[PDB]
Structures are given as structure tokens and as C-alpha cells.
Write a protein that binds this ligand. Structure first.
Ligand SMILES: CC(C)(COP(=O)(O)OP(=O)(O)OC[C@H]1O[C@@H](n2cnc3c(N)ncnc32)[C@H](O)[C@@H]1OP(=O)(O)O)[C@@H](O)C(=O)NCCC(=O)NCCS
Ligand SMILES: CC(C)(COP(=O)(O)OP(=O)(O)OC[C@H]1O[C@@H](n2cnc3c(N)ncnc32)[C@H](O)[C@@H]1OP(=O)(O)O)[C@@H](O)C(=O)NCCC(=O)NCCS
Ligand SMILES: NC[C@H]1O[C@H](O[C@H]2[C@H](O[C@@H]3O[C@H](CO)[C@@H](O)[C@H]3O)[C@@H](O)[C@H](N)C[C@@H]2N)[C@H](N)[C@@H](O)[C@@H]1O
Ligand SMILES: NC[C@H]1O[C@H](O[C@H]2[C@H](O[C@@H]3O[C@H](CO)[C@@H](O)[C@H]3O)[C@@H](O)[C@H](N)C[C@@H]2N)[C@H](N)[C@@H](O)[C@@H]1O
Ligand SMILES: Nc1ncnc2c1ncn2[C@@H]1O[C@H](COP(=O)(O)OP(=O)(O)O)[C@@H](OP(=O)(O)O)[C@H]1O
Lengths: 176, 181
């Protein structure tokens, strides 16, 4: 149980489908077409057991604007461990892989965490954002209050004032 | 399995060791006759580097990084091609074709479209492979809101993957430091 990293373009149709179905099941169905689209394009950390995917996390590239700078961010999407495999720290192995990618390629990692996972991210050195969050929408900056309190960041090569504004870039569905 | 000689190899930025990273940076900077800034280098990072090796040196490079391009209010998932370069002593042998086979493979497997802003000398190379010239006005979604990027008009090319785009429409890239396209 060490995770393997595979870019989206290296997944065959069968594997891509196994991943989407496992993740959707792990979120008990609370996983939409846009949530799935948000897991695509970057590196997937995958753990298998007998040809079955039992754990997944994806890290995709985007920009987060902090103090006027568009920081190169590794954004974590779709972190999930199959229900019958929970409580064995498989998530720790997924994050070891995701974090290795962030140290090698990004200025910071970030994600919008489900409440049950917040203790886990904090224990690993992720920081909860306290300042107001926004998104740079096509019409300009728009606050995203529904996502306040869910965003976490992992600084790699920058010290951060986590009470400053933080503004993610645009996409469909949930922007955070 | 043959030797894989001059087949481009795809390596994520996080998997580049410092020696390879330095070799890519100096090779690409030299290929652009030095017109390759600190921000142009930052723009090649975070995605997949297609690398061609010869005697332990990088003789060709192209990076595909992920960003969003906004088309008709839609945020398209885009593989953006940066730093396309073939070291000067190896030019004229179609190695850029080997780089683009890998780049295009990445687009079909992971993005809604590939895009890039081409130097004038390479516009015909991309067009011959099926990349479409973007005819409409380009802009960027800067922190203050949309703003036109006329200097970049006529340089952008796209490779749609199973989506249909009206290439005469406005196309707006997302924000970053330096050249936004
Ligand atoms: C959050 C999640 C990835 C954790 O994966 P994991 O590998 O099971 O994590 P851990 O083993 O460290 O367990 C985390 C907690 O889950 C709980 N847990 C233990 N066994 C469990 C089980 N059999 N079923 C469900 N939850 C269980 C415990 O509270 C545990 O905390 P502890 O370390 O103090 O015991 C997983 O629960 C999951 O996929 N949940 C649904 C999707 C989700 O919210 N993903 C996160 C999005 S940010
Ligand atoms: C653009 C580039 C990647 C093409 O690489 P390549 O593998 O040499 O491509 P090709 O073999 O198909 O040659 C392209 C053209 O370059 C020209 N060429 C041939 N030999 C050349 C040489 N030794 N030196 C420079 N240009 C040469 C020819 O016009 C050739 O076209 P042709 O096949 O119709 O005769 C390369 O010229 C380069 O790195 N240029 C500098 C950086 C830059 O502009 N890159 C593109 C950024 S979008
Ligand atoms: N519902 C699937 C999504 O869940 C998590 O992300 C969301 C996050 O968690 C989901 O919401 C449920 C209630 O907290 C929680 O139970 C979550 O369902 C949510 O609180 C934020 N407001 C928006 C985040 N995008 C994951 N980080 C995200 O990758 C995934 O696509
Ligand atoms: N100067 C280095 C950059 O060049 C190419 O891209 C630029 C592109 O080409 C550079 O400009 C020279 C003249 O066209 C050409 O000689 C080019 O120098 C330029 O025309 C666009 N206005 C902006 C593009 N970012 C590459 N696509 C880009 O990846 C690289 O970072
Ligand atoms: N009325 C409720 N019934 C059941 N669970 C709820 C209720 N309202 C909110 N929740 C859940 O309880 C959590 C509430 O989220 P909050 O962001 O308010 O954080 P909190 O638990 O630290 O107070 C969520 O769990 P999840 O993110 O792990 O999925 C949310 O789903």
C-alpha cells in the first residue's frame, strides 16, 4: 500500500471508469459530472487491491491569486477510500503521493475539504484559510462565502498570511 | 520493444531531477535565442514535459500545462503547450514532430483542447498537423476583469478534442504573470 501516480492521459477507458465509479460511491453519490471533470488533467494517486481501485486522490494544476500574485497551485480533488477499506490509513498513502507532487512542481497545494477530513489535513501540516475566499469569475472577482471555512493550503516555497484574501480561478460547478 | 530512440518521453515536472531541470532550462533558453524570461520558464512548470534524449542530453522539449480558456462563458479544460524547442544542432530532422506526437497524445487523453501561442516560424508546422488558427479576438481574464490582448491576436492555435469550437469567436485565457498567452 503505497500509491502509484498516473497522469490522466495515461489512464485507459476501463481504469478511468473504475476510478470515477469508486469515487462516486465513496462520496455516497454526492459527486457530480463537474466534480468528476475537476479531477481530470493532472496526476492521480491510486492504490489497487486485486485489480480493483481502492483509493484515489488527484492533484490538478490551477492558479490561486494571493496578494496580486497568481500562485502555481496543485489542487487536490476526489480524495476517496473505498468504504470497506476505511480506517486503515490508506488516505495517508494517497497524500504522501499528492504531497510529493506538490513539493516537486508547485508553490502551494490547496483543496476544499469535507468536514470529516479537516483533522487529517491539519495533522499533516495543511493550514485552514481564515481570510475571505473569492473566485475570479468572467465578470470579475466574486466572493465565495459558501466555501469559507473549507479551504486548506499547504505552502511549499512561500510563507503565507492565511487571513489575506485568496481568489481561485474560474471553472464550472464548485469553483473551490 | 525497440530502443525507443528519439521517441519523446513524458515526465511530470515533479519527477525531474535538478540536473535534467537545469538542462531543459538552458537548452530551451538557448533555443529561443535568449528571449525566454524567468516567467516564460515558470510557465513550463506543473504539467508533463515531453523530452527527447540523445547521449544523456535533452535535445528537444515541449511542456503541456493545464489551464482554463473561457469560450462563450464556458471554462474549457486546456492543455497549453509551452517551451517547444529542438536544440539547434538537431533542427531540420522533424524531431518537433516526435515532440508533438506526445503532446497531442496528452491532449486526447486528458483535455478538451490543446492550445498554444506560436512563434511565427512555427505557425505552419502546427497548421499542417491539424491545429486550427484562432481567428477571433483574444483576451485574458485579469484580476480587474476581461481585457483584450491584441498583441497576441493571430498567434494562437487550438486542437479541439471531440468539442466543436467557433474559432472566429472571442477566446479569453486565465491569468498569470508575464505573457498571458
Ligand atoms: C476521508 C477518507 C478519505 C479517509 O480515508 P481513510 O483511509 O479511511 O482514513 P483513516 O484511516 O485515517 O481514517 C479516518 C477516520 O475515519 C474513521 N473511520 C475508521 N474506520 C472507518 C470505517 N470503517 N468507515 C468509515 N469511517 C471510518 C475514523 O474517524 C478515522 O479517524 P482515526 O484515525 O482517529 O481512527 C474516507 O473516509 C472517505 O473516502 N470518505 C468519503 C469521501 C470524503 O469525504 N473524502 C474527502 C474529501 S476532502
Ligand atoms: C520550431 C522548431 C521547434 C522546429 O523543430 P524542428 O524539429 O527543427 O522542425 P522541422 O524539422 O520540421 O523543421 C522546421 C523548419 O525549420 C527550418 N530549418 C531546417 N533546418 C533548420 C536549422 N538547421 N536551423 C533552423 N531552422 C531550420 C525549415 O524551414 C523547416 O521546414 P521544412 O521541413 O518545411 O523544410 C525549432 O525550429 C526551434 O526550436 N525553434 C526555436 C524555438 C521556437 O520558435 N519554438 C516554437 C515555439 S511555439
Ligand atoms: N462532493 C464532492 C466534492 O467534495 C469535496 O469538495 C467540496 C466540499 O465537500 C463536499 O461537501 C460536503 C459537505 O461538506 C462533503 O461531504 C463533500 O461532499 C464542500 O464542503 C465545499 N463547499 C465544495 C468542495 N468542492 C472534495 N474535496 C471534492 O474534491 C469533491 O469533488
Ligand atoms: N519567448 C518565449 C516564448 O515564445 C513562444 O510564445 C510567445 C510567442 O513567441 C515568441 O515571440 C517571438 C516572436 O513571435 C517568438 O520568437 C517567440 O520568442 C509570441 O509571439 C506571443 N506574443 C506570446 C507567446 N508567449 C512560445 N510558444 C512560449 O512557450 C515561450 O515561452
Ligand atoms: N443537518 C445535518 N445532518 C447531518 N449531517 C450534517 C448536517 N448538516 C451538516 N452536516 C454535515 O456535518 C458537516 C458540517 O460541516 P461544517 O463545514 O459546518 O463543519 P463542522 O462539522 O466542523 O461544524 C459536514 O460533513 P462532511 O463535510 O464530512 O460531509 C456536513 O455534511
Amino acid at each position: 500500500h503505497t500509491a502509484r501516480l498516473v497522469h490522466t492521459a495515461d489512464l485507459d477507458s476501463e481504469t478511468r471508469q473504475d476510478i470515477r465509479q469508486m469515487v462516486t460511491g465513496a462520496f455516497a453519490g454526492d459527486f457530480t459530472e463537474t466534480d468528476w471533470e475537476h479531477t481530470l488533467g493532472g496526476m492521480h494517486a491510486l492504490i489497487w487491491h486485486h485489480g480493483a481501485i481502492i483509493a484515489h486522490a488527484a492533484v490538478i494544476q490551477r492558479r490561486l491569486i494571493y496578494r496580486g500574485n497568481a500562485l502555481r497551485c496543485g489542487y487536490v480533488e476526489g480524495v476517496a477510500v473505498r468504504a470497506d477499506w476505511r480506517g486503515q490509513r490508506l488516505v495517508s498513502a494517497l497524500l504522501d503521493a499528492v504531497e510529493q507532487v506538490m513539493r516537486g512542481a508547485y508553490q502551494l497545494g490547496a483543496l476544499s475539504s469535507s468536514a470529516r477530513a479537516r483533522r487529517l489535513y491539519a495533522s499533516r501540516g495543511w493550514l485552514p484559510w481564515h481570510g475571505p475566499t473569492s473566485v475570479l469569475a468572467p465578470t470579475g472577482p466574486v466572493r465565495t462565502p459558501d466555501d469559507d471555512g473549507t479551504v486548506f493550503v499547504l505552502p511549499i516555497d512561500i510563507s503565507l498570511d492565511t487571513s489575506a484574501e485568496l481568489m481561485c480561478d474560474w471553472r464550472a460547478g464548485d469553483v473551490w
